[PDB]
Design a protein around this ligand. Structure first.
Ligand SMILES: [Cl-]
Ligand SMILES: [Cl-]
Length: 85
């Protein structure tokens, strides 16, 4: 629905997986973040709901070493640290 504005570092992350936008819906941000996690194989192959990001740009942006995709409240707070509200 509403548009969101990634901060510069998150924008570079999104573009690095082929996004060609500066302005996004939240749905699009999640779409490209998922593609980033997939393409960089940040999830554990045997526990695919767990993302390990402590040595990746994503960890610097989200401010955690790892997270579970089941933790949606936490994921939204981590994404919003990276949006210009
Ligand atoms: Cl930034
Ligand atoms: Cl975790």
């Amino acid at each position: 629905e509403t548009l969101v504005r990634p901060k510069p570092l998150l924008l570079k992350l999104l573009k690095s997986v082929g996004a060609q936008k500066d302005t996004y819906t939240m749905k699009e941000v999640l779409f490209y973040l998922g593609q980033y996690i997939m393409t960089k194989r940040l999830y554990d192959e045997k526990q695919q709901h767990i993302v390990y990001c402590s040595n990746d740009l994503l960890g610097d942006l989200f401010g955690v070493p790892s997270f579970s995709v089941k933790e949606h409240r936490k994921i939204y707070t981590m994404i919003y640290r990276n949006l210009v509200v």
